[PDB]
Design a protein around this ligand. Sequence first.
Ligand code: DCR
Length: 133
Amino acid sequence: MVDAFLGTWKLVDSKNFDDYMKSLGVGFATRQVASMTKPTTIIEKNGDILTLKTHSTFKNTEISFKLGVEFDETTADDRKVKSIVTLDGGKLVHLQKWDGQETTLVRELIDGKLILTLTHGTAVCTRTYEKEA
Ligand SMILES: CCCCCCCCCCCCCCCCCCCC(=O)O
């Protein structure tokens, strides 16, 4: 099910991440650093538990979850959200809810690259990651 997503991924392109961050209320100085950061995302499974690590020179995060089971998450920008991750159409769909707001983080594989689409409000960001050997 999730197996083609597993591994270590490096950011190789980013479109509209500033728009997405601004929509979430991220401050200009943080957006400024984030716009020049290239994180590494590591996705691993142990049985039904997935762990997703995002590493950078600026901020690091880690979450563990079971598909289809809600979990508490504190995001990189310090939002305390209710999260759920599912597979939908072969895409890994992560929905975050807080204060009546929502954002989606949708991952899919196209030609071997991992495409992350981030939507909040009207902002739509597309980030492309390439697999590390
Ligand atoms: C956590 C590792 C850093 C990720 C690179 C961006 C650097 C920090 C930006 C922090 C403020 C904006 C955070 C809004 C959440 C987006 C999470 C997913 C982005 C991605 O994994 O590429």
